[PDB]
Write an enzyme that holds these catalytic residues in place. Sequence first.
Site, short mmCIF file in Angstrom:
data_model
loop_
_atom_site.label_atom_id
_atom_site.label_comp_id
_atom_site.label_asym_id
_atom_site.label_seq_id
_atom_site.Cartn_x
_atom_site.Cartn_y
_atom_site.Cartn_z
N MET A 165 -2.12 10.49 9.73
CA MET A 165 -2.70 10.10 8.45
C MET A 165 -1.65 9.80 7.38
SD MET A 165 -5.35 9.52 6.53
CE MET A 165 -6.75 10.14 7.44
N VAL A 166 -1.88 8.71 6.65
CA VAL A 166 -1.00 8.30 5.56
C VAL A 166 -1.70 8.66 4.25
CG1 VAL A 166 0.25 6.43 4.46
CG2 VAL A 166 -0.22 6.35 6.92
N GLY B 111 -2.52 6.12 10.27
CA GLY B 111 -1.37 5.32 10.69
C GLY B 111 -1.08 5.40 12.19
N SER B 112 0.09 4.92 12.59
CA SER B 112 0.49 4.93 14.00
C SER B 112 0.58 6.34 14.58
CB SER B 112 1.84 4.25 14.19
OG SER B 112 1.72 2.85 14.11
N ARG C 26 0.51 -8.24 8.94
CA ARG C 26 0.12 -6.83 9.01
C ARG C 26 1.30 -5.89 8.74
NH1 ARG C 26 0.23 -8.69 14.07
NH2 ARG C 26 1.98 -7.95 15.38
N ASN C 27 2.52 -6.39 8.88
CA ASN C 27 3.69 -5.54 8.67
C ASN C 27 4.42 -5.72 7.35
OD1 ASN C 27 3.45 -3.98 11.04
ND2 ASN C 27 4.31 -5.64 12.28
N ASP D 253 8.93 -7.74 14.92
CA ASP D 253 7.49 -7.61 14.76
C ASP D 253 7.04 -8.10 13.39
OD1 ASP D 253 4.85 -6.99 15.40
OD2 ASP D 253 5.07 -4.83 15.11
N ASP E 187 7.14 -2.42 7.96
CA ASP E 187 7.01 -1.63 9.19
C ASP E 187 8.20 -2.02 10.06
OD1 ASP E 187 4.72 0.04 10.78
OD2 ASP E 187 5.83 -1.23 12.20
N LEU F 72 -4.90 7.46 2.35
CA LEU F 72 -4.82 6.01 2.24
C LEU F 72 -5.40 5.40 3.51
CD1 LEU F 72 -1.29 5.37 0.70
CD2 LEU F 72 -3.52 5.05 -0.36
N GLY F 73 -5.13 6.04 4.64
CA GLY F 73 -5.63 5.55 5.91
C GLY F 73 -4.85 6.09 7.09
N1 LIG Z 1 4.19 2.15 1.85
C1 LIG Z 1 2.85 2.21 1.73
N2 LIG Z 1 2.31 2.08 0.50
C2 LIG Z 1 0.98 2.13 0.39
N3 LIG Z 1 0.05 2.31 1.33
C3 LIG Z 1 0.62 2.44 2.54
C4 LIG Z 1 1.98 2.40 2.82
N4 LIG Z 1 2.20 2.56 4.18
C5 LIG Z 1 1.00 2.69 4.69
N5 LIG Z 1 0.00 2.64 3.75
C6 LIG Z 1 -1.45 2.77 3.96
O1 LIG Z 1 -1.67 3.50 5.15
C7 LIG Z 1 -2.41 2.69 6.10
C8 LIG Z 1 -1.88 2.94 7.49
O2 LIG Z 1 -0.47 2.64 7.47
P1 LIG Z 1 0.41 2.11 8.71
O3 LIG Z 1 1.51 1.30 8.16
O4 LIG Z 1 0.71 3.29 9.56
O5 LIG Z 1 -0.59 1.20 9.41
P2 LIG Z 1 -0.71 0.90 10.90
O6 LIG Z 1 -1.65 1.91 11.46
O7 LIG Z 1 -1.05 -0.54 11.06
C9 LIG Z 1 0.84 1.17 11.54
P3 LIG Z 1 1.56 0.23 12.71
O8 LIG Z 1 1.57 -1.10 12.06
O9 LIG Z 1 2.90 0.83 12.94
O10 LIG Z 1 0.64 0.37 13.86
C10 LIG Z 1 -2.25 1.26 5.59
O11 LIG Z 1 -3.35 0.46 5.99
C11 LIG Z 1 -2.20 1.44 4.08
O12 LIG Z 1 -3.48 1.55 3.50
#
Ligand SMILES: Nc1ncnc2c1ncn2[C@@H]1O[C@H](COP(=O)(O)OP(=O)(O)CP(=O)(O)O)[C@@H](O)[C@H]1O
Lengths: 8, 291
Positions: free
Chosen positions: B25-26, B21-22, B144-145, B140, B158, B18-19
């Site tokens: 990989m998600v 993450g923090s 974006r969250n 927060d 988040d 999906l992408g």
């Molecule tokens: N519950 C969920 N359902 C669907 N897709 C999700 C998801 N949580 C994350 N994703 C996907 O994974 C990607 C990265 O997720 P994440 O929530 O870690 O983003 P981020 O990197 O902004 C984290 P943070 O906001 O903590 O820095 C998102 O852009 C989305 O495409």
Amino acid sequence: GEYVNIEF
Amino acid sequence: VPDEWEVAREKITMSRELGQGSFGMVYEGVAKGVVKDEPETRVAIKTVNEAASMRERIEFLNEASVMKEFNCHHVVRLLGVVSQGQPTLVIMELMTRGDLKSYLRSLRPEMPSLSKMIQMAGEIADGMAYLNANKFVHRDLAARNCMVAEDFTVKIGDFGMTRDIYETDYYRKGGKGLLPVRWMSPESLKDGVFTTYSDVWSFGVVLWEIATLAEQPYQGLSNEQVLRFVMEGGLLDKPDNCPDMLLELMRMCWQYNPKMRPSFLEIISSIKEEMEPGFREVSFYYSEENK
Ligand SMILES: Nc1ncnc2c1ncn2[C@@H]1O[C@H](COP(=O)(O)OP(=O)(O)CP(=O)(O)O)[C@@H](O)[C@H]1O
């Protein structure tokens, strides 16, 4: 960037 | 007895990425037996790089722990944790439309109705009301969250900065830290104090993000100017063609005096007649837990 350093 | 949140790695399958993450990989996938009367369930799979540090692994797991406490239709649901073997995984409710910021940007003419906007505001406020009711300050809140489900339902998703405030009703940040300056209340920017009141301030910013299709808050101002602008009483502008109810909610959420801001319950109360019918059935607001 959305998160910026800040100190208290 | 068994850890109710632990799930055998074998019951989870990763269909695709999906992408990033923090902490890693998600992926989108499927999990068996995580929901009642449900053989298998579509899920989002957040992982931690097998090379991550103890510090990162702890933060990753701490976010999962906090989520174990939430059970609300407008808060992204934790469904399980895989803490045996590699990589460390956390499985959550799948939100097919991604984060709210990206969803709003995707609606830009270059690259929503008043009712759709108010519906989003109500859902976000309901999730936040739930959070605050359980004595948690999010800290927060931002587009974006928040995440968007298939049926367009918006949910808080988040909790990286979420803190329990049961004992003192507030959280004070000490030392240095990377904080969401453009979403922080004046008092938070001044002495790092976070309350349900500052969460309401951020909600105001999220409303602005919705009405502007995710424009960058205080665009054109450096972080420094933002800090000064806000602490001196400045506010984001009134988005063009923004629904009056949202402009008023913003005005209310951005009262300099935190005590003058409405609570999430008061916010929901003021716009409840504009919410879709099913809100009464799934919302924390109309639930018996809220009395
Ligand atoms: N519950 C969920 N359902 C669907 N897709 C999700 C998801 N949580 C994350 N994703 C996907 O994974 C990607 C990265 O997720 P994440 O929530 O870690 O983003 P981020 O990197 O902004 C984290 P943070 O906001 O903590 O820095 C998102 O852009 C989305 O495409």
